[PDB]
Design an enzyme around this catalytic site. Structure first.
Site, PDB file in Angstrom:
ATOM      1  N   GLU A 149      -9.304  -4.327  -3.738  1.00 56.40           N
ATOM      2  CA  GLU A 149      -8.553  -3.293  -2.971  1.00 56.40           C
ATOM      3  C   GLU A 149      -9.426  -2.221  -2.316  1.00 56.40           C
ATOM      4  O   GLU A 149      -9.035  -1.704  -1.321  1.00 56.40           O
ATOM      5  CB  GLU A 149      -7.570  -2.585  -3.873  1.00 56.40           C
ATOM      6  CG  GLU A 149      -6.585  -3.399  -4.671  1.00 56.40           C
ATOM      7  CD  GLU A 149      -5.398  -3.851  -3.864  1.00 56.40           C
ATOM      8  OE1 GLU A 149      -5.467  -3.816  -2.649  1.00 56.40           O
ATOM      9  OE2 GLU A 149      -4.392  -4.297  -4.463  1.00 56.40           O
TER      10      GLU A 149
ATOM     11  N   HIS B 222      -7.596  -5.269   0.551  1.00 56.95           N
ATOM     12  CA  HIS B 222      -6.374  -4.526   0.637  1.00 56.95           C
ATOM     13  C   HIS B 222      -5.602  -4.967   1.915  1.00 56.95           C
ATOM     14  O   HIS B 222      -6.086  -4.856   2.998  1.00 56.95           O
ATOM     15  CB  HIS B 222      -6.770  -3.043   0.566  1.00 56.95           C
ATOM     16  CG  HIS B 222      -5.615  -2.109   0.458  1.00 56.95           C
ATOM     17  ND1 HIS B 222      -4.526  -2.430  -0.232  1.00 56.95           N
ATOM     18  CD2 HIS B 222      -5.521  -0.758   0.558  1.00 56.95           C
ATOM     19  CE1 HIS B 222      -3.618  -1.459  -0.131  1.00 56.95           C
ATOM     20  NE2 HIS B 222      -4.190  -0.446   0.391  1.00 56.95           N
TER      21      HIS B 222
ATOM     22  N   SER C 298       0.891  -1.156   0.000  1.00 54.98           N
ATOM     23  CA  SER C 298       0.000   0.000   0.000  1.00 54.98           C
ATOM     24  C   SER C 298       0.952   1.235   0.000  1.00 54.98           C
ATOM     25  O   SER C 298       1.761   1.334  -0.869  1.00 54.98           O
ATOM     26  CB  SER C 298      -0.870   0.018   1.205  1.00 54.98           C
ATOM     27  OG  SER C 298      -2.017   0.835   0.956  1.00 54.98           O
TER      28      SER C 298
END
Ligand SMILES: O=c1ccc2c([nH]1)CCC[C@@H]2NCCCCCCCCCCNc1c2c(nc3ccccc13)CCCC2
Ligand SMILES: O=c1ccc2c([nH]1)CCC[C@@H]2NCCCCCCCCCCNc1c2c(nc3ccccc13)CCCC2
Ligand SMILES: *[C@@H]1O[C@H](CO)[C@@H](O)[C@H](O)[C@H]1NC(C)=O
Ligand SMILES: *[C@@H]1O[C@H](CO)[C@@H](O)[C@H](O)[C@H]1NC(C)=O
Ligand SMILES: *[C@@H]1O[C@H](CO)[C@@H](O)[C@H](O)[C@H]1NC(C)=O
Ligand SMILES: *[C@@H]1O[C@H](CO)[C@@H](O)[C@H](O)[C@H]1NC(C)=O
Ligand SMILES: *[C@@H]1O[C@H](CO)[C@@H](O)[C@H](O)[C@H]1NC(C)=O
Lengths: 528, 528
Positions: free
Chosen positions: B324, B437, B197
């Site tokens: 995500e 995510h 991320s």
């Protein structure tokens, strides 16, 4: 004498014709206006002066002067749309098929030919009215109207070339039908106007126009609608194109009077030889001289009339065919042929989109490109050809029509929507062209009932079902007799397929593409 | 003693930790910088000054000051991401897991945590390096870096609060590995940085930035890339947000030096309490204090560095997860919940698009809507839920990454791309969230190897293939020992799924949507 009819302007003598083992009365070439020649070129039509003696209405009339398509000379597929009589400016006549014996006050149907307002004829084989008149017991009329510069040269504020005269030709034939059809066994209270392409646009323009509303009862629009992007122009674009026609022919341009005077001295085909030259962009499915939004025939913009409900409130039956776009690609876009599969490179795709949306900025073109390209497989010839085929048909016909239908249905008294997707078994065009603009007409006019034209029995049955829907609709406002075509409603948006298989009902015709074309793209072009 | 290692700044004593019924060495809580406290809050890190005696590295350090998520208190699915140690500004430490016995000069992997640049910790259970280190025989380091205003408050022109100091923390931890890892049996010539991320974005900013390039050999980016729309701001937006932070706290705003001084007298959590207030719009997946495009860490705009090949040329491995976007919608968009199927009305879809693309004008919003709505079935709560999910993912992670990977591959020396789409058997989040995510990380760090965590055998096998691909790539620039993960190339654009099924190679990840996000939407927003 069935064949000898006295009308408000004089007597007329028809001829008895054969149809499918029987006979009916036909009245061909009846004049409804004074010939719009000489000084009357570009003027509003005047009613035909009463004549003494018997009008010989036993043969078809002249066709109006128009650009003759010579792309595929002697090819049946293109020749069937070209004039089949001598061309003349003396061409304002109509034609009537009356069942034998003559009916009492039967449903009337008036056909308005297409051809992009630049061409068409009332006399083509595929518009022969005798099958539909016979089989459905209606009185069938086909009109005619000036086309090209003759019908639609617009110099707004001149009374000499005001614009919209071809539409007023149409309106005078309808006035004539209102006035005279009762003598042929029609009810002037039960007349349906119908037509295809610029003929279907025409139909809807009479729904809109206050001077036309009271001259018919209900309407059928095939593959055209008033609001089509090719079907009209502003007073200022009509004036620019008229002036440019002048410049192409070395006319004096100092005033409207001198321009008009010079254009009135030129032979018809001199105008037609430069007609395409006045178009402001390279394009497809655009025509030089079309209806003008004038404040008279159309008192305000089409959209504003459609939002306000300023239009004839009645019943409509309309629809589209599956591949409206294909012939325009053949005739004007790179990579297409009638002798190949017309697999299209990515380069030719992109050039086809610029042609199809000639008014779009770059952001516009990108939007269209984006909506219609499979980016996993962008070099696939078949997908590029078919994606460009859908652009052309969605942009020019289908989505304009779905806009019209949705706006109309809010005020109307009833809407029946079809999707015609039968590819005829005897078609001479290649497979890739699919269900082509104009190719539902033969079924409407009952041509598959003629055994020598080599249609299947299932195609005869379909033509019969279509004829009966159309004639039933004309008679009653509802194509179904007392298996069922539902009313298109704002809520449910139902439509039927029209093909040889059993009738299926669907909803929301081409909604996804039609949102792009009716809501997003205009919004983007207005913002950029 | 394997546990007593002498580094350039002093001696350190680690601890023997059990792993999968063997053991290995851990050095937890090694300082790499001076404590960035008092008058060093907002300033560049400085190197740790040498200590005397033996640093006890048997336990994890403090985590950096950060907004603690309290949305689902005690719920394991959100608490696994929160700090599990005390928060302090005194937080610049790193962790190392060394195989036992100590290797001679082995591959190193350095982990950079995510959490949007406003959060994260080196110490989470999910980042425990002992499994990967033990299984793959590598030296595994996790660094830390200041987050939130403490790390990214940017007042360009000031030397007290230049911006990007969290990036420079990361870089100092890298210089410390470069200088000290040989003493723990790592090769400083063979270091890989990897992160997820904001970690992944981080890794790519080091590839870009000239000052970082020579401190690692190659790179792995998981669900982030440097050009993510949330991952950076201009020096103007950075300045504006720092001033607004001041205003929210009644600071003297008359100069940089006065605003900075006031922000340095505040306790850490008073900055954190108003952190979110400085964002320009209602949004999701946007974070207040992020990297700035300063002209120093980044000499020019990320896009021109990418276009010109101004970046480290090496091998990269990167990829994205299937869903995500989903936890961002749960935390911040209407109709979403952890306890239901989160079927979303059309109204909550629309209000979701505005949050997802908070910069967009109306035309923009329209485009997005149009690209992700099925207009046949627009009130289908599931299709709206999933459509918005894809929006959030595609815009914030997948399409930024696919832009990056295509520009990178034109200059780089080898790219491998993955699409992680395995939903874990023991997940505690609902099915609608899909492959979330962050939820590849547990695979990469070998947690399915621990029987007590109750993964399936096949999830065990998956984690082993994943650890082996990452460590083989780290060792050699190629994840395969020579079923084969093919190279991503400019032409063929191949990638693989990573899941429990036999390998599938596919091409052109999310191109249809990435074309919209990377090419069209930006042209649209640039015109209007
Ligand atoms: O669309 C074009 C194509 C080409 C060009 C332009 N526009 C403008 C710029 C210049 C370029 N070439 C100039 C001359 C234009 C040629 C005129 C087009 C001829 C069309 C023929 C109309 N015939 C009909 C056909 C069909 N359906 C029809 C249905 C409605 C009535 C006419 C029809 C189906 C297949 C073949 C033909
Ligand atoms: O994204 C949002 C959400 C909400 C809001 C905004 N932005 C801004 C406007 C105001 C609004 N609410 C303000 C409060 C902000 C709360 C911030 C969200 C907390 C997220 C916590 C980080 N947790 C992580 C999670 C996951 N993965 C992660 C992987 C990366 C590291 C952090 C992760 C998977 C599932 C659940 C959690
Ligand atoms: C009517 O006109 C046509 C064609 O010009 C002619 O051939 C036809 O035989 C005429 N018939 C009568 C009865 O006047
Ligand atoms: C047509 O109008 C009449 C009354 O004016 C009404 O009963 C009928 O329902 C209308 N039909 C439709 C389909 O709008
Ligand atoms: C159709 O079929 C017949 C016989 O098989 C043939 O002689 C005729 O030419 C065809 N009709 C047309 C007009 O194409
Ligand atoms: C280092 O710290 C840990 C835990 O608090 C402990 O078990 C060990 O005693 C320590 N070693 C020394 C030399 O103090
Ligand atoms: C990496 O670089 C070397 C030479 O510098 C080259 O021969 C090799 O093919 C490169 N590989 C790729 C995938 O670019």
């Amino acid at each position: 004498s069935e064949l000898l009819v006295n009308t408000k302007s004089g007597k007329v003598m028809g001829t008895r014709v054969p149809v499918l083992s029987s006979h009916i009365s036909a009245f061909l070439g009846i004049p409804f206006a004074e010939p719009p020649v000489g000084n009357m070129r570009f003027r509003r039509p005047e009613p035909k002066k009463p004549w003494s003696g018997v009008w010989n209405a036993s043969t078809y009339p002249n066709n109006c002067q128009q650009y003759v398509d010579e792309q595929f000379p002697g090819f049946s597929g293109s020749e069937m749309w070209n004039p089949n009589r001598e061309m003349s400016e003396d061409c304002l006549y109509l034609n009537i098929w009356v069942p034998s014996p003559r009916p009492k006050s039967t449903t009337v149907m008036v056909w308005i030919y297409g051809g992009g307002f630049y061409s068409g004829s009332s006399t083509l084989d595929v518009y022969n009215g005798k099958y539909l008149a016979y089989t459905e017991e209606v009185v069938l009329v086909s009109l005619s109207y000036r086309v090209g510069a003759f019908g639609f040269l617009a110099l707004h504020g001149s009374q000499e070339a005001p614009g919209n005269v071809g539409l007023l030709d149409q309106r005078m034939a309808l006035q004539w039908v209102h006035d005279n059809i009762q003598f042929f066994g029609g009810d002037p209270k039960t007349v349906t106007i119908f037509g295809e392409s610029a003929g279907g646009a025409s139909v809807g323009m009479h729904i809109l126009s206050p001077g036309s509303r009271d001259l018919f009862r209900r309407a059928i629009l095939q593959s055209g609608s008033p609001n089509c992007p090719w079907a009209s122009v502003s007073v200022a674009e009509g004036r620019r194109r008229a002036v440019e026609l002048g410049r192409n022919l070395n006319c004096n341009l100092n005033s409207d009077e001198e321009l008009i005077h010079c254009l009135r001295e030129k032979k018809p085909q001199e105008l037609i030889d430069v007609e395409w030259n006045v178009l402001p962009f390279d394009s497809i499915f655009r025509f030089s001289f079309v209806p003008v939004i004038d404040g008279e025939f159309f008192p305000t913009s089409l959209e504003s009339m459609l939002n306000s409900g300023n239009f004839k409130k009645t019943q409509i039956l309309l629809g589209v065919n599956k591949d409206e776009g294909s012939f325009f690609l053949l005739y004007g876009a790179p990579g297409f042929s009638k002798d190949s599969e017309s697999k299209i490179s990515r380069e030719d795709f992109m050039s086809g989109v610029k042609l199809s949306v000639p008014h779009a900025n770059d952001l516009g073109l990108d939007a269209v490109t984006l909506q219609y390209t499979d980016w996993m497989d962008d070099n696939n010839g078949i997908k590029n050809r078919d994606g460009l085929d859908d652009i052309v048909g969605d942009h020019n016909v289908i989505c304009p029509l779905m806009h019209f239908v949705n706006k109309y249905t809010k005020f109307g008294n009833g809407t029946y929507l079809y999707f015609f997707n039968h590819r005829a078994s005897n078609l001479v065009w290649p497979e890739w062209m699919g269900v082509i603009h104009g190719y539902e007409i033969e079924f409407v006019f009952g041509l598959p009932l003629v055994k020598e034209l080599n249609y299947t029995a299932e195609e005869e049955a379909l033509s019969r079902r279509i004829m009966h829907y159309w004639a039933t609709f004309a008679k009653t406002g509802n194509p179904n007799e007392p298996s069922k075509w539902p009313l298109f409603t704002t809520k449910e948006q139902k439509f039927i397929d029209l093909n040889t298989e059993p009738m299926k009902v669907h909803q929301r015709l081409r909604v996804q593409m039609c949102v792009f074309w009716n809501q997003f793209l205009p919004k983007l072009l207005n913002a950029t």
